[PDB]
Design a protein around this ligand. Structure first.
Ligand SMILES: Cc1ccc(C(=O)Nc2cccc(C(F)(F)F)c2)cc1Nc1nc(N2CC[C@H](O)C2)nc(-n2ccnc2)n1
Length: 279
């Protein structure tokens, strides 16, 4: 019962599951409604037959989500633990996940709006890191966008596909996941946002990505990208873990750039892949 100390217990009569929107570890995820007039929610279930480890992980997940209370972290509405199936219930965003959102809205936002999304993501990550929580799977697909353009860090589980091109070298090579490997991932998220959801490294295979990184290559600047933003993402990709900025440094820089917005007018040179010659 101590694991669920920051959570509210929801009675099953208050929950209506409507459509399957995904799969959990041992159950389905649904889009539904919560009566507490009604509010749309996402609902992850733990279905009959779950193992002891699955129960420990499921209630542990609920417990930490209840612990987190931050503008840029997905909100837990509550948990059903006293009845079967057990459920984790979160807020729901009609705009959905950030990766698909940006790809469907290519070129529709200002630079200031894009950088503001990154400041929010960075604030959520600073909070998680300070709370001693290592995310391990930070990517645009794990970020929800609300109707105010506020980004909420989430974790929907692996898509399970290993996200090599979001993962820092030390986490791939020897399983060292820390808030500094999350900083590497945040740099990739910065590139995802500024490109409107382009695939990191394009058609390179996972092996080719790792080889390029080991050889010293890094993603080139997005089109129309502020110089300061590319400089920042490049510093997230330092091979030496200890040289990367901490999330506190990232938040501070992004906040200062937004508050002095002329700083974002200086653009990094874009390397064109194709030359068009006209008079
Ligand atoms: C129900 C649910 C359960 C858990 C989580 C979750 O984040 N746990 C987590 C665990 C550890 C750390 C963090 C931390 F906070 F740190 F990052 C977060 C999110 C959702 N909620 C949810 N799940 C989906 N899924 C899952 C299957 C598909 O991918 C779609 N979709 C939406 N959704 C869609 C549109 N509006 C909302 N909501």
């Amino acid at each position: 019962q101590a694991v669920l100390k920051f959570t509210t217990e929801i009675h099953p009569s208050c929950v209506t599951r409507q459509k399957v929107i995904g799969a959990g570890e041992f159950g389905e995820v649904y889009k539904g409604m919560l009566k507490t007039k009604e509010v749309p929610v996402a609902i992850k279930t733990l279905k009959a037959g779950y193992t002891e480890k699955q129960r420990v992980d499921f209630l542990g997940e609920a417990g930490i989500m209840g612990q987190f209370s931050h503008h840029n972290i997905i909100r837990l509405e509550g948990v059903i633990s006293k009845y079967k199936p057990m459920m984790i219930i979160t807020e729901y965003m009609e705009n959905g996940a950030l990766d698909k959102f940006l790809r469907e809205k290519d070129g529709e936002f200002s630079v200031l709006q894009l950088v503001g999304m990154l400041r929010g993501i960075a604030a959520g990550m600073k909070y998680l890191a300070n709370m001693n929580y290592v995310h391990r799977d930070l990517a645009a697909r794990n970020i929800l966008v609300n109707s105010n353009l506020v980004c909420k860090v989430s974790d929907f589980g692996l898509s399970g596909k290993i996200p090599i091109r979001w993962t820092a070298p030390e986490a791939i090579s020897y399983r060292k996941f820390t808030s500094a490997s999350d900083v590497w991932s945040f740099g990739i998220v910065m590139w995802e946002v500024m490109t409107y959801g382009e695939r990191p490294y394009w058609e390179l295979s996972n092996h080719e990505v790792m080889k390029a990184i080991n050889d010293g290559f890094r993603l080139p600047t997005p089109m129309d990208c502020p110089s300061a933003i590319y400089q920042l993402m490049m510093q997230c990709w330092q091979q030496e873990r200890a040289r990367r900025p901490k999330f506190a440094d990232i938040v501070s820089i992004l906040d200062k750039l937004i508050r002095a917005p002329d700083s974002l007018k200086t653009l990094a040179d874009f390397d064109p892949r194709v030359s068009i010659r006209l008079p």
